[PDB]
Amino acid sequence: PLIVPYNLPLPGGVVPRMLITILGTVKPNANRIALDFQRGNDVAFHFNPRFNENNRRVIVCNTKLDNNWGREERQSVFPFESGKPFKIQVLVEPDHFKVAVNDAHLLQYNHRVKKLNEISKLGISGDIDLTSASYTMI
Numbered sequence: 001p002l003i004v005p006y007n008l009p010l011p012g013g014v015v016p017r018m019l020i021t022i023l024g025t026v027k028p029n030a031n032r033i034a035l036d037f038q039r040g041n042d043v044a045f046h047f048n049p050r051f052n053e054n055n056r057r058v059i060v061c062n063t064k065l066d067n068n069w070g071r072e073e074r075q076s077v078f079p080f081e082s083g084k085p086f087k088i089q090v091l092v093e094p095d096h097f098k099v100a101v102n103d104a105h106l107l108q109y110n111h112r113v114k115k116l117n118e119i120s121k122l123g124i125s126g127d128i129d130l131t132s133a134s135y136t137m138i
């Protein structure tokens with residue numbers, strides 16, 4: 001498959017209408033997954049499913065600027081399942097990232113980092129087997 005952590009360059013940054021698709025399988029005793037859209041050392045959008053935060057499943061989203069995390073946005077709808085295959089799609093819209101999992105809308109994250117053309121790498125990490133990571137324009 002692909003080695004994790006995996007770094008997917010996004011040449012020239014992100015732009016509205018760009019669709020990123022990630023296919024993989026959650027490992028059986030997974031603890032976390034993370035997608036990190038980076039602008040240099042900053043993390044424009046961190047998407048972090050947590051399988052056991054105080055015995056609860058939660059998705060945490062945030063931005064890291066100058067090595068400091070901002071205000072978390074938390075989602076209790078949790079579509080990932082230990083041991084099972086998933087598809088994550090991230091659609092860049094003008095004002096938000098829009099995330100769908102297994103073809104169902106999950107969340108939207110308003111752009112905090114506004115220089116979209118400078119968000120030029122995606123890091124994929126955590127307790128997954130990674131099958132495919134790619135992008136296209138819709």
Ligand SMILES: OC[C@H]1O[C@@H](O[C@H]2[C@H](O)[C@@H](O)[C@H](O)O[C@@H]2CO)[C@H](O)[C@@H](O)[C@H]1O
Pocket residue numbers: 046048060061062069070072
């Ligand atoms: O916000 C994303 C960021 O969270 C860090 O963990 C936070 C944690 O979510 C919060 O409840 C606690 O009070 O502070 C921790 C440290 O900032 C993670 O360490 C980091 O990897 C990101 O996931």
